[PDB]
Amino acid sequence: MLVTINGEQREVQSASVAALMTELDCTDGHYAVALNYDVVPRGKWDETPVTAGDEIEILTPRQGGLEHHHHHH
């Protein structure tokens, strides 16, 4: 489906957002998906399908100076 990914209208083969981020290799480090600018939590990527003509903005969330980035226990 032809979906506007991060401002680029990109023709993908994935029908699910889990599969979309995996297809685009955006599942590791710290990436996020914004479906119609609304960020989908990673635990909902598999629950959420992609829709043709939608705008999937891949966000790289600023979590460097975020205490939770690494917390013992």
Side-chain angles (χ1 to χ4, degrees), residues 1-2 4 9 15 18 30 33 36-37 41-42 46 48 51-53 55 57-60 65-66 72:
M1 63 187 67
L2 184 62
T4 308
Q9 300 188 270
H30 58 116
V33 57
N36 294 262
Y37 303 106
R42 50 71 50 188
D46 183 71
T48 310
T51 42
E55 192 174 280
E57 176 180 54
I58 302 177
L59 288 174
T60 54
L66 206 184
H72 54 260

Side-chain angles (χ1 to χ4, degrees), residues 14-45:
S14 48
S16 178
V17 171
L20 178 59
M21 303 294 285
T22 309
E23 187 170 272
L24 301 172
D25 182 65
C26 311
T27 49
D28 304 78
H30 58 116
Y31 300 100
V33 57
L35 184 73
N36 294 262
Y37 303 106
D38 182 274
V39 183
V40 181
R42 50 71 50 188
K44 300 198 70 61
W45 290 2

